[PDB]
Design a binder for this molecule. Structure first.
Ligand SMILES: N[C@@H](CSOO)C(=O)O
Ligand SMILES: [Fe+2]
Length: 186
């Protein structure tokens, strides 16, 4: 039974229940993420920005089944075009707006990767991606407003591929945490 999370801590407790088993009900998880109303005081501890690129801040390590983290995007900060390593990936906006651009998996032949679609993700909305859906790029295109997002990945993963938009060629990247549980982890 899905109830509205009252706070980030409550959301975390609910997520531990939803991931207690071996499978994932994507629509239920997205619905509970969306139902949490962002409260900046509750996540300020994790919202550690860097001037030059977006940061990844671990909030909860789940139950062996997922990682929950907060990403902090300065003005103009964005990602590579990337995949999600055979995992579910939910993104909920906590502050600001992000542009998500979708791309198909490239063919083996070298070619420009042309966007398939794009949308603006707005405060409190929860999006979902997985490799079956495609690849994406996520960007804070604002010149004036930093963005903060809450991401849930299941299973957890710490490597992915970045894709060259000009050719479709991929390179393996190791992801790092800027902080864990509020503690900077240089
Ligand atoms: N997947 C990117 C963020 S966009 O992914 O919803 C990352 O975890 O760094
Ligand atoms: Fe992503």
């Amino acid at each position: 039974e899905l109830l509205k999370p009252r706070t980030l801590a409550d959301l975390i407790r609910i997520l531990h229940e939803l991931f207690a088993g071996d499978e994932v009900n994507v629509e239920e998880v997205q619905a509970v993420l969306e139902a949490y109303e962002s409260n900046p005081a509750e996540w300020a501890l994790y919202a550690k920005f860097d001037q030059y690129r977006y940061t990844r801040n671990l909030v909860d390590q789940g139950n062996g089944k997922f990682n929950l983290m907060i990403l902090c995007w300065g003005e103009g900060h964005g990602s590579s075009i990337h995949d999600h390593t055979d995992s579910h990936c939910f993104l909920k906006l906590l502050q600001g707006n992000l542009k998500e651009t979708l791309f198909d998996w490239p063919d083996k032949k070298s070619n420009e990767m042309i966007k398939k679609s794009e949308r603006t993700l707005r405060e409190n909305q929860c999006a979902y991606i997985n490799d079956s859906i495609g690849l994406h790029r996520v960007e804070n295109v604002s010149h004036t407003e930093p963005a903060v997002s809450l991401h849930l990945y299941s299973p957890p993963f710490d490597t992915c591929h970045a894709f060259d938009q000009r050719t479709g060629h991929k390179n393996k990247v190791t992801m790092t945490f800027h902080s864990k549980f509020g503690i900077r982890t240089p």
